[PDB]
């Protein structure tokens, strides 16, 4: 038999070491590469939207620099007169755009806050923004839930949908937690 590191014994010794290993890389077992935020099932190339080796999401259109026709470079001439960004002024379509586009930015959260303010709630399981439909008060508001007519935002068809459902405050999210520390690089904590 093989007492050594190059035998079968040597193999389960490495596997059972991953139990006690707090490190994110176990060169013996590997890792689920589907969970690295790349669409390995994509029928389209990944490289055109390849963010960086540390990013868990592809390039958004706001990330891609584009040589826009000269005329569109407004900011240099209108900087002073141009209004400042105040999410309270903007409509719900804008807040929903800002929300659905800034996955992992203070902007998703700042938008989620302005949405939360306007009474919209986030279903943690159904993964949708819900709010009270005009004039329809829930049938039985109780200790753990409420049931009635609700307006919810459909991000695939980009519209508010009246869908009648039962919602448990447990499955509903509280006031968005705004990260206080400004010096955060998600590239540093990437596994």
């Amino acid at each position: 038999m093989v007492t050594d590191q190059f035998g079968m014994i040597g193999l389960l010794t490495f596997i059972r070491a991953a139990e006690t290993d707090p490190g994110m890389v176990h060169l013996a077992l590997g890792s689920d590469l589907t969970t690295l935020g790349l669409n390995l099932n994509s029928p389209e190339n990944l490289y055109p939207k390849f963010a960086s080796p540390w990013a868990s999401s592809p390039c958004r259109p706001q990330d891609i620099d584009f040589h826009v026709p000269s005329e569109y470079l407004t900011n240099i001439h209108i900087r002073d007169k141009l209004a400042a960004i105040k999410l309270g002024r903007y409509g719900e379509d804008l807040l929903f755009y800002l929300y659905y586009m800034n996955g992992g930015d203070v902007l998703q959260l700042l938008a989620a806050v302005e949405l939360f303010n306007r009474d919209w709630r986030y279903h943690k399981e159904e993964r949708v923004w819900i709010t009270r439909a005009p004039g329809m008060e829930p049938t039985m508001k109780t200790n753990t839930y409420e049931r009635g007519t609700y307006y919810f935002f459909d991000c695939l068809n980009w519209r508010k949908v009246a869908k009648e459902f039962h919602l448990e405050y447990d499955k509903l999210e509280e006031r968005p937690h705004l990260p206080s520390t400004f010096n955060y690089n998600p590239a540093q904590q990437a596994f």
């Binding site: 013996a28 080796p53 540390w54 040589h67 590239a187």
Partner: protein
């Protein structure tokens, strides 16, 4: 350094101004209105007088943007109230203008004269930046800051990118610089470096948009520089958090190459395999899973799959890494003499010693020579079988000088030798091709003809190691394992081994679910 007096103050003024001219509305977007006026200013101030002066100016300009970055990062820590986004913006403001100046100078010299002066000037500026980089890196050390160089290099690359033949001369310039800044040379620049070689525009131009695939061997060099860098860390089991971030980063890059450019990984697999340590199962499995796009691989799990009938079993894969070179000229001559004559018979006896380039107690074996020997013997065997008028079979591969080497190595080597040797065979068990078939039979024969339990345990180990890890798993490797577990030689081995050590049975149980 040897700078004429007042030159630094003169340069730092000229740049400080260009930084102000660059952001101005009058410049012209591309900054051409501001630049013509700025070239003249550079002539009257005499910074363009001699080649040495143009050189010193470019170095001084680079040195200023680096100070502006250290000064920015200082008022970041020495005042936590100051906004990091605002601090980063101060660096870019200065760096972007310096980039536009370089890009406009290189572009102007290319217009006024030719593509050779343009290119020579491009290389001159990169050479100067690399120079500033390595000095800073070596002096500042643990305080070294990658942001100025990283912003300079990518912005310049993007500024220059947008004929095709003319663009190859520019990619080459960037490739040379990236190779000069490989992490064994600039380790403190490694994250910015990986962000550069893997940039979506760099990958695109290098692998997809360069014609006749001339960019492929250069890109492969950069990947080998990365693997060469990681190898001692990977080899030594434990990896630091910073190292895990770089490792997963490498995984993302490779996963993109495997998806978008499978033929690329396919063609340079031997090259990459020679530099990746044998313990990096998943990393190596990514390269060994790469296969040509439009090729249907039969499902390895299809019941009653006769592999001996797939028309691909007679086609050799492409190998763009000339493996034969690693061999000392006398060794290759002695090997060729044995393969065609079965003489000297002392060649087998001396073979283990020859594969033991142990000048160090830590190296023990010459792993590159182990791989080339295996692939060479198999390729020569595939040739000798076909020339004799046959297809490599479980019956044609045996009782030849080729199998004498493999059966010798299998017995004569120690458990480390054997592990390294079988890994060399296993690295050829990939997509359906003549090498996959040849080395599948070889491995299956070696197990079935083994007179020692150790030889059997080690083959099971290399195959099982490679299938117990997460996906991807090479076609050939799955086929080999499925074939082995059917052999009565294995059933007998498994019965006696699983009775002595039972936790081993859970390993085999993993393979059913885990596999492709």
């Amino acid at each position: 350094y040897d700078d004429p007096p007042g030159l630094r103050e003169k340069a730092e003024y000229l740049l400080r101004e260009w930084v102000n001219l660059y952001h101005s509305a009058a410049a012209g977007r591309d900054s051409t209105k501001a630049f013509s006026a700025f070239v003249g200013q550079m002539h009257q101030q005499g910074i363009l007088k001699t080649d040495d002066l143009i050189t010193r100016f470019f170095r001084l300009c680079t040195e200023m943007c680096v100070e502006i970055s250290y000064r920015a990062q200082a008022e970041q820590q020495h005042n936590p109230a100051a906004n990091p986004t605002m601090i980063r913006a101060k660096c870019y403001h200065n760096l972007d203008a310096f980039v536009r100046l370089i890009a406009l100078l290189v572009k102007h010299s290319g217009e006024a004269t030719n593509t050779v002066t343009k290119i020579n000037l491009l290389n001159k500026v990169l050479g100067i930046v690399v120079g500033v980089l390595l000095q800073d890196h070596d002096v500042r050390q643990s305080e070294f800051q990658q942001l100025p160089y990283h912003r300079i290099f990518i912005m310049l690359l993007l500024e220059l990118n947008a004929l095709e033949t003319i663009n190859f001369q520019t990619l080459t310039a960037f490739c040379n610089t990236f190779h000069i800044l490989r992490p064994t040379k600039a380790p403190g620049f490694v994250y910015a470096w990986l962000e550069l070689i893997s940039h979506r525009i760099f990958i695109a131009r290098m692998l997809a948009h360069t014609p006749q695939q001339k960019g492929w061997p250069m890109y492969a060099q950069l990947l080998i520089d990365l693997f060469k860098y990681l190898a001692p860390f990977l080899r030594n089991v434990e990896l630091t958090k910073p190292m895990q971030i770089l490792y997963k980063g490498t995984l993302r890059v490779l996963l993109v190459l495997l998806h978008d450019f499978p033929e690329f990984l396919c063609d340079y697999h031997y090259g990459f395999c020679d530099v990746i340590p044998p313990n990096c199962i998943q990393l190596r499995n990514l390269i060994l899973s790469a296969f040509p796009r439009n090729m249907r691989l039969p499902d390895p799990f299809t019941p009653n799959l006769k592999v001996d009938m797939l028309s691909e079993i007679n086609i050799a894969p492409r190998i763009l890494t000339n493996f034969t070179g690693v061999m000392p000229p006398q060794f290759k001559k002695d090997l060729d003499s044995y393969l065609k004559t079965r003489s000297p018979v002392t060649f087998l006896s001396d073979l283990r010693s020859n594969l033991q380039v142990s000048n160090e107690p830590g190296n023990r074996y010459n792993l590159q020579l182990i791989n080339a020997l295996v692939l060479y013997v198999g390729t020569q065997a595939i040739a000798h079988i076909h020339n004799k008028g046959s297809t490599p079979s479980m019956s044609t591969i045996t009782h030849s000088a080729h199998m004498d080497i493999f059966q010798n190595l299998a017995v004569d080597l120690d458990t480390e030798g054997r592990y390294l040797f079988l890994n060399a065979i296993a690295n050829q068990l990939r997509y359906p091709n003549s090498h996959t078939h040849y080395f599948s039979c070889t491995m299956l024969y070696l197990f079935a003809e083994a007179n020692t339990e150790a030889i059997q345990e080690q083959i099971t180990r290399v195959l099982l190691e490679r299938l117990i890890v997460n996906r991807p798993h090479p076609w050939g490797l799955l086929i080999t394992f499925i074939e082995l577990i059917k052999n009565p030689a294995f059933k007998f081995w498994n019965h006696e081994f699983v009775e002595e050590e039972p936790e081993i049975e859970k390993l085999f149980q993993s393979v059913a679910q885990c596999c492709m």
